[PDB]
Amino acid sequence: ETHINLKVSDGSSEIFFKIKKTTPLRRLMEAFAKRQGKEMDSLRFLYDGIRIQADQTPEDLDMEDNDIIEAHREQIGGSTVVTTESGLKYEDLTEGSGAEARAGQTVSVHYTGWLTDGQKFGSSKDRNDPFAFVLGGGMVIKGWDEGVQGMKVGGVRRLTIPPQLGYGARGAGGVIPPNATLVFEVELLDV
Ligand SMILES: COc1cc(CCCOC(=O)[C@@H]2CCCCN2S(=O)(=O)Cc2ccccc2)cc(OC)c1OC
Numbered sequence: 303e304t305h306i307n308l309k310v311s312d313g314s315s316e317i318f319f320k321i322k323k324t325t326p327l328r329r330l331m332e333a334f335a336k337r338q339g340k341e342m343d344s345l346r347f348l349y350d351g352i353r354i355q356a357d358q359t360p361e362d363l364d365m366e367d368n369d370i371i372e373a374h375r376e377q378i379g380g381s382t383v384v385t386t387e388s389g390l391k392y393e394d395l396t397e398g399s400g401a402e403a404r405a406g407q408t409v410s411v412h413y414t415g416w417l418t419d420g421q422k423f424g425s426s427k428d429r430n431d432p433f434a435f436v437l438g439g440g441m442v443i444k445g446w447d448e449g450v451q452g453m454k455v456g457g458v459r460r461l462t463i464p465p466q467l468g469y470g471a472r473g474a475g476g477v478i479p480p481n482a483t484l485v486f487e488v489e490l491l492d493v
Contacts, residue, residue, distance in 0.1 A: 303367065306360055310334050310347065312373035314485075317421025321360060327355035334373060339414050339422060348372045383462075390445050391462035395487065398454025403493045405438030405451060412489040423477045432491055443468050445484070453490040461486045 308319045309332065315338060319330050327347070331354070335342040347354045349363055349371050375381075375395075381392045403409050410432045414425040425435045435442050437450055445463030453459055463484040465471075473479045 306365060306367045308369055308371055310371045310373050314418055322426060323361045324359055326357050326359055327354055331356055338457045339425060344375060346374045346376045387468060388448060389464045390448055390467055392449050393460040394457060395460055396458040398457030398490055400455050403437055403450055407437050408434060409437050409450060409490060410434045410492040412491060413486050415484055415486045418483050423475060431456050451463060455490050455493060458487055458489045462490060
């Protein structure tokens with residue numbers, strides 16, 4: 303056999319590939335990162351608990367048909383996920399500089415949002431149009447009004463938003479179903 307099938311899983315997104323055994327894994331890794339809107343740089347791919355480098359081939363790693371590659375985010379700065387009283391979770395992927403965003407300020411952000419199955423349902427980067435709103439003003443979902451408070455400019459924060467802080471029993475956009483937990487990465491551009 304010259305080719306094998308591989309599954310890459312990050313716990314949410316799973317993507318299936320068929321790769322020639324002598325092909326470097328770079329293209330597969332890039333494909334998985336692109337599907338999440340992310341750069342390959344912000345991800346780590348493991349096979350049999352060992353990190354894969356882009357130049358390595360399935361042959362190099364003795365991979366077999368239907369083997370699994372696990373995908374993770376690694377932030378060099380570390381990972382601390384905080385649960386709030388409301389059940390919101392936040393994780394500062396990057397901490398910003400300067401003053402913290404406060405309720406009542408108009409902020410400008412970039413964001414991407416996904417379902418817990420990894421499906422991207424929206425991004426400001428799609429129209430390359432930052433999104434502005436009045437923080438704590440009730441014009442965005444509750445999880446955002448709560449979760450963007452405390453961010454600093456240049457910060458990127460990952461919000462995990464339970465449905466009562468999102469779209470609840472209604473869902474939205476022909477994409478988000480009832481009772482869906484939402485994941486956003488939000489970049490604070492200005493406050
Ligand atoms: C369910 O409650 C509300 C929902 C909205 C939705 C419009 C604003 O959108 C958002 O809150 C979020 C965060 C800010 C960026 C855009 N989104 S969004 O979730 O990505 C919008 C979306 C796009 C595609 C499919 C489904 C949903 C506005 C609201 O206020 C006018 C709401 O009431 C507080």
